[PDB]
Design a protein around this ligand. Structure first.
Ligand SMILES: Nc1nc2c(ncn2[C@@H]2O[C@H](COP(=O)(O)OP(=O)(O)OP(=O)(O)O)[C@@H](O)[C@H]2O)c(=O)[nH]1
Ligand SMILES: Nc1ncnc2c1ncn2[C@@H]1O[C@H](COP(=O)(O)OP(=O)(O)CP(=O)(O)O)[C@@H](O)[C@H]1O
Ligand SMILES: COc1c(Cl)cc([C@@H]2c3cc4c(cc3C[C@H]3C(=O)NC(=O)N23)OCCO4)cc1Cl
Ligand SMILES: Nc1nc2c(ncn2[C@@H]2O[C@H](COP(=O)(O)OP(=O)(O)O)[C@@H](O)[C@H]2O)c(=O)[nH]1
Ligand SMILES: [Ca+2]
Ligand SMILES: [Cl-]
Ligand SMILES: [Mg+2]
Ligand SMILES: [Mg+2]
Lengths: 346, 54, 437, 424
């Protein structure tokens, strides 16, 4: 009989995994501040890693990788890609990005040096401004740059994918979310079920000012969008239907046109930071569930937009993924008395 | 990757290698702390014996 | 030649002091009776080992040491031990009753009655020094004597020897090895009072030593003798440059200069490799590249923490054995490209390297096999703040209920001293955070 | 180092005599006081409980006290009766009639100064006396009334030595007289103020163990006292035997008592024996020890939480195995160990086993569950006091009933102070 502790009540993923552990009879949940735990479903912020692995007679396992934030926060990801030789200043699958600090090192001199050149070259020069809401798309550097002087958080602006793969019917954008499990042996497990977040609005290249045709986020579509849920339920398309659409329209498959690149991007990012976050010879053990966000352009080329460290699953998939977290991540360290994952290995 | 200030002797060697350039109370104060704690102990003992006297 | 005086306080300091001086005698070829045949000058010396050993007309080399414990028993075994003749009676100070795991009882109640006696015996050794650099102080964080009396002694040594360096070897508490329940209190108390009197403190987590003894020596329940013999090798590795001809860390001031840029942050992490069981019949001897790489494995650190999530202020590699400078730079060049070793911005990213050709001495009948080359890395990393966070948390849990506080107030301490001490630690953790992230 | 042992009253002297018979056998001392052992671990810390008289004779540092001569006359003619220093028998002739007031105020006052005479002589012959241990019951007159009177006099003269008692709690199941809740309520008042640590030995728990588990249908006081001397031997083992952990009374009190008034311990022993050959294992030895049926205060530990626990294992066994099992009992029922005292369970091992057992485990717990014991006594107290019943025995000795109200209030406060820590 194992003991675990919960420290983030909000996570729908790790609330469901706690129920499953309890539903085996062999796991009991302790109070928050009881330090005699086998497993910790710790908090998102300021998780006390310095206190793990010191309890005598206890193998301790936490559901987060210490140092994984370098991948999961925007500005850090941009600096991680540009400065890591294992990703090159330019990797073909990440948009040209520049991190720039507000009025209150900075690459705004470097961005305008590239932005101006593209303006002189007549090449389309739309860029997107983001931070870790408050999202701005524009075709002039000054419009975006003044926009971030109001904000107090360091911002990053990257090239906007002006030509996206547009699902028909609707002429509409999508983003692919993949769920990745890294266990304590640093095996990388891609969940065989992803999701497409569909915009319910036709894509317009004239006004990047109206939000709905450009932003596929569920909340940006549930509220601020006009015909949410018209083409698919809840503006969510799953892989089986996306595969059928690619076969029908583009005469290809999801595995070849997109999924090989997704597996390459996930592997590159996680192998890159492995020596910095691996718990291979550590006094405690870590696993973590990740959410990778991908974009597909008109040439069926995959771009990485963001990696999310505390991700939430789709309601239908919740049961299958939360169960897989137990078998792959938790019961591999604490046994009890086909696979839904694709293993990514070198 | 340079080696500086290398010294050699019979017992061994020492050197430096730079990979990248850079980018109290007095005696009486103590006697008083120690004596302040002593009276607090004495004051407690007296209250006990006063209670034991009752 | 400038002398160093060693001070061993409480059970842990005395017993570790036993382990060290046993090892120092083997490393310098000193018999248990005090005779050193290799020394060609009788009754006098300017040699490097004279920094730790005075000389007598009869040829006896006597440690420049003081052993003080409020309980008589642990020092009574130095008196009856194999090295009994080595030590002068006036060097071994005992009391009648111990401090009961109570910092306040050791600092105030019993500390007052014996502090002036310890200082007279220490001056009796300082008066035989032509030029003293300072003191090496060995103690536990958790014991009543080790915490309470040491911090009192540190205050009076700062008064009586103001121009002198003071170095600390401190045993950090760990529940695997027999601990009191109030050792967090004693640890925070003695740190707050000693922080401004110590110039460099080498901290040793009993959990780390215990775990190395089970993994590398495959002892399933180590004893103090196992722990101390291992701690003695690390200590010997750190103090070797004081007792041998060399050009790196030749006096106590240089430990401060090379390892402690900011004074409050004066707790270098020590990492030691290789540790191999003597029972290993067939054993393959590790190289410079291997043992220098093991110096960045957390399982070889004296304190369990993750240096990857910190910043280095200073790094010093102390090799012992068949090591050559060429192989150190090769091993360094490959490790830097394979490991997350981020220095602070205001410090040079580099390594002060010291090589001593004599491979580590090991005690006959010990658990440590003799190797051809070994290395101790002394690194000042902000990662050791994790050790303070652990300790402060245990302190906070007990203090929220004022648990066990009455024992300390009963010895004349004031409850406010708890909060002042805790507030100092909050400042210390902040200082690590400023430099660290 | 040195401990002075005092045994007061019939129960105090009967459990004390059994205690000395047991540990004299463990240390290899025959009834004449002559050592006859084969190991030398026995004699290394023998001075804690024995003075060495001339002729290689070991004499217990024990003082025997009673207001009635009969009980000590049986001791002197008992098995190890001649091993005690003849001058250390101090007794009157009147008895205390199971009356706390007689032991504390009238007959006991007439005799307390000569007991303290002997306590001084034994203390002066101490290299560095660490404290005193008192064996008594709380339900009679001599051991409870004159016993607690002895404690406060001893504290007045040695205010900085440790005061330790083995106190037998009365139970209607094993009752001599109806006034036992009165004598116990008055004694607990004294103990809660003048002792550093009290081992609560509930006669009800002893009776249930002798009947429910040991299967003895009609238990005698000898049956109960078999369990007490076994318990007493286990708790004192670390004091009187060489080990990796060499224990003393003060470090015990510093680590077991997070708050001054909460110093009432419930002990536990395994294997529970009746006056076998199948040796236990460290797993089953640990599970029995922590079970209620092995505990000497008739409380349910699951109804409270452990503030601190000290445990010792006797015999040849793996210390790695003792660690796993103790760490296993914690990690499996960590609900019953408080989170604001980190690492509050300590464990020791002594390879010298008790007589007749290959392996044994003894348990000292500061649990909030002990409040059930004082709740029981306060209820039996109130049932009579609300009608002033049997009080004339006490007012006849000069006590006013206001002193009864004060002693009842202080015990209810004690119960209440244990309650608050059961929740935090
Ligand atoms: N590494 C090591 N640690 C020890 C040794 N002896 C004691 N300790 C540790 O020291 C702490 C207890 O402090 P002690 O040195 O025994 O206590 P003390 O300084 O004698 O003070 P008092 O006994 O309270 O008067 C515990 O955390 C032990 O784990 C030892 O020989 N080696
Ligand atoms: N370079 C780019 N080109 C096109 N669209 C982009 C883009 N960068 C961001 N987006 C848009 O932003 C939307 C979501 O915002 P983004 O992923 O940048 O932050 P976010 O907070 O909404 C997700 P996360 O929780 O993973 O950080 C995507 O659906 C996509 O349409
Ligand atoms: C019969 O067994 C005993 C006896 Cl008598 C006394 C002890 C106590 C003790 C008790 C503690 C504890 C620490 C210590 C320290 C230890 C020591 O170094 N010397 C000493 O006297 N100690 O932490 C929480 C709970 O209780 C332990 C045992 Cl096991
Ligand atoms: N366990 C135990 N309890 C006893 C013994 N003798 C008496 N008692 C209990 O102690 C109380 C009576 O105290 P007693 O020692 O006879 O009175 P005293 O001699 O006047 O102090 C009653 O609760 C008895 O049940 C004994 O030998 N063993
Ligand atoms: Ca010489
Ligand atoms: Cl000076
Ligand atoms: Mg001690
Ligand atoms: Mg009777």
């Amino acid at each position: 009989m194992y003991t675990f502790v919960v420290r983030d009540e909000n996570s729908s993923v790790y609330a469901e995994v706690s129920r499953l552990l309890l539903a085996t009879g062999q796991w009991k949940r302790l109070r928050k501040d009881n330090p005699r735990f086998n497993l910790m479903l710790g908090e998102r912020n300021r998780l006390p890693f310095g206190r793990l692995g010191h309890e005598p007679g206890l193998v301790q396992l936490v559901n987060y990788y210490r140092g994984a934030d370098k991948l999961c926060r925007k500005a850090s990801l941009v600096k991680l890609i540009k400065t890591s030789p294992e990703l090159s200043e330019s990797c073909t699958w990440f948009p040209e990005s520049y991190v720039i600090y507000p009025t209150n090192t900075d690459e705004r001199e470097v961005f305008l040096a590239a932005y101006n050149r593209r303006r002189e070259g007549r090449e389309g020069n739309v860029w997107i401004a983001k931070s870790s809401e408050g999202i701005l798309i524009s075709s002039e550097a000054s419009e975006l740059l003044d926009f971030i002087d109001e904000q107090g958080q360091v911002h990053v602006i990257q090239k906007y994918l002006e030509k996206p793969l547009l699902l028909e019917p609707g002429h509409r954008k999508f983003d692919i979310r993949s769920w990745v499990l890294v266990d304590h042996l640093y095996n990388i497990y891609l969940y065989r079920e992803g999701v497409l977040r569909t915009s319910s609005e036709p894509y317009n290249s004239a006004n990047f000012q109206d939000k709905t045709c450009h932003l596929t986020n569920h909340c940006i579509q549930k509220e601020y969008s006009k015909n949410y849920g018209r083409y698919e339920e809840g503006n969510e398309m799953f892989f089986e239907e996306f595969n059928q659409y690619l076969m029908d329209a583009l005469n290809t498959t999801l595995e070849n046109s997109i999924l090989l690149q997704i597996k390459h991007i996930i592997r590159s990012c996680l192998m890159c930071i492995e020596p910095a976050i691996s718990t291979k010879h550590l006094h405690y053990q870590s696993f973590q569930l990740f959410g990778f966000d991908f974009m597909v352009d008109e040439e069926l080329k995959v771009w990485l937009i963001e990696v999310n460290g505390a991700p939430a699953c789709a309601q239908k998939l919740y049961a299958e993924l939360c169960q897989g977290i137990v078998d792959v991540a938790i019961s591999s360290v604490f046994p009890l008395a086909t696979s839904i994952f694709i293993k990514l290995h070198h | 990757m340079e080696v500086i200030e290398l010294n050699k002797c019979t017992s061994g060697q020492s050197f430096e290698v730079i990979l990248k350039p850079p980018s109290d109370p007095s005696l009486e104060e103590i006697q008083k702390k120690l004596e302040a704690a002593e009276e607090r102990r004495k004051y407690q003992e007296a209250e006990l014996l006063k209670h034991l006297a009752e | 030649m400038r002398e160093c005086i060693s001070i061993h306080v409480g059970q842990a300091g005395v017993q570790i002091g036993n382990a060290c001086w046993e090892l120092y005698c083997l490393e310098h070829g000193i018999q248990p009776d005090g005779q050193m045949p290799s020394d060609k000058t009788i009754g006098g010396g300017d040699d490097s080992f004279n920094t730790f050993f005075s000389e007598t007309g009869a040829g006896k080399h006597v440690p420049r040491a003081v052993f003080v414990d409020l309980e008589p028993t642990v020092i009574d075994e130095v008196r009856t031990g194999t090295y009994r003749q080595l030590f002068h009676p006036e060097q071994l100070i005992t009391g009648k009753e111990d401090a009961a795991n109570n910092y306040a009882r050791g600092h105030y109640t019993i500390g007052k009655e014996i502090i002036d006696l310890v200082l007279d015996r220490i001056r009796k050794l300082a008066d035989q020094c032509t030029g003293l650099q300072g003191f090496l102080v060995f103690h536990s964080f958790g014991g009543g004597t080790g915490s309470g009396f040491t911090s009192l002694l540190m205050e009076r040594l700062s008064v009586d020897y103001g121009k002198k360096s003071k170095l600390e070897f401190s045993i950090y508490p760990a529940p695997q090895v027999s601990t009191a329940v109030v050792e967090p209190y004693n640890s925070i108390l003695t740190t707050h009072t000693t922080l401004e009197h110590s110039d460099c403190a080498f901290m040793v987590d009993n959990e780390a030593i215990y775990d190395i003894c089970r993994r590398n020596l495959d002892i399933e329940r180590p004893t103090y003798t196992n722990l101390n013999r291992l701690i003695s090798q690390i200590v010997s590795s750190i103090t070797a440059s004081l007792r041998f001809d060399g050009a790196l860390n030749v006096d106590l001031t240089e430990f401060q200069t090379n390892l402690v840029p900011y004074p409050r942050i004066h707790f270098p992490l020590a990492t030691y490799a290789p540790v191999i069981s003597a029972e290993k019949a067939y054993h393959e001897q590790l190289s410079v590249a291997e043992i220098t790489n093991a110096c960045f494995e957390p399982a070889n650190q004296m304190v369990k923490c993750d240096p990857r999530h910190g910043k280095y202020m200073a790094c010093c590699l102390l090799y012992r054995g068949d090591v050559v400078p060429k192989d150190v730079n090769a091993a360094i060049a490959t490790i830097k490209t394979k490991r997350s070793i981020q220095f602070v911005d205001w410090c040079p990213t580099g390594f002060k390297v010291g090589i001593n050709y004599q491979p580590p001495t090991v005690v006959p009948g010990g658990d440590l096999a003799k190797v051809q080359r070994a290395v101790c890395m002394l690194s000042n990393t902000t990662a050791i703040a994790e050790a303070w966070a652990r300790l402060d948390h245990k302190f906070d849990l007990m203090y929220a209920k004022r648990a066990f506080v009455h024992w300390y107030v009963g010895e004349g301490m004031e409850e406010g001293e708890f909060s002042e001490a805790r507030e100092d630690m909050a400042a210390l953790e902040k200082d690590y955070e400023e430099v660290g992230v | 180092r040195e401990i002075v042992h005092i045994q007061a009253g019939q129960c105090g002297n009967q459990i004390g005599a059994k205690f000395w018979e047991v540990i004299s056998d463990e240390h290899g001392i025959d009834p004449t006081g002559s050592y006859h052992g084969d190991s030398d671990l026995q004699l290394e810390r023998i001075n804690v409980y024995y003075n060495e008289a001339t002729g290689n004779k070991y004499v217990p540092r024990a003082i025997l006290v009673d207001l009635e001569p009969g009980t000590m006359d049986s001791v002197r003619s008992g098995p190890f009766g001649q091993i005690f220093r003849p001058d250390n028998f101090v007794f009157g002739q009147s008895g205390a009639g199971n009356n706390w007031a007689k032991g504390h105020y009238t007959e006991g006052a007439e005799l307390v100064d000569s007991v303290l005479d002997v306590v001084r002589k034994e203390s002066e012959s101490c290299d560095c006396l660490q404290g005193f241990q008192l064996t008594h019951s709380l339900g009679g007159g001599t051991g409870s009334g004159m016993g607690t009177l002895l404690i406060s006099k001893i504290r007045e003269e040695y205010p900085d030595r440790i005061m330790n008692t083995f106190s037998v709690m009365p139970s209607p199941k094993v009752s001599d007289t109806v006034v036992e809740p009165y004598n116990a309520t008055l004694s607990v008042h004294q103990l809660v103020e003048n002792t550093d640590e009290t081992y609560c030995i509930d006669n009800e728990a002893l009776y249930d163990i002798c009947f429910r588990t040991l299967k003895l249908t009609t238990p005698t006081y000898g049956d109960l006292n078999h369990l007490v001397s076994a318990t007493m031997s286990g708790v004192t083992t670390c004091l009187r035997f060489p080990g990796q952990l060499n224990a003393d009374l003060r470090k015990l009190a510093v680590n077991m008592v997070p708050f001054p008034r909460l110093h009432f311990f419930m002990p536990g022993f395994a294997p529970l024996t009746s006056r076998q050959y199948r040796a236990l294992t460290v797993p089953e030895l640990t599970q029995q020890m922590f079970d209620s049926k092995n505990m000497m205060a008739a409380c349910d530990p699951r109804h409270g939480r452990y503030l601190t626990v000290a445990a010792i294992f006797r015999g040849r066994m793996s210390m790695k195995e003792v660690d796993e099992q103790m760490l296993n009992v914690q990690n499996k029922n960590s609900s019953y160990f408080v989170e604001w005292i980190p690492n509050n369970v300590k464990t020791a091992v002594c390879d010298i086993p008790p007589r007749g057992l290959k392996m044994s485990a003894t348990f000292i717990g500061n649990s909030t569950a002990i409040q059930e014991l004082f709740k029981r006594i306060s209820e039996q107290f109130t049932a009579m006091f609300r009608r002033k019943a049997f009080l004339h025995w006490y007012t006849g000795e000069g006590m006013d009933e206001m002193e009864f109200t004060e002693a009842e209030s202080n015990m209810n406060d004690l119960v209440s102070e244990y309650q608050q820590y059961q929740d935090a």
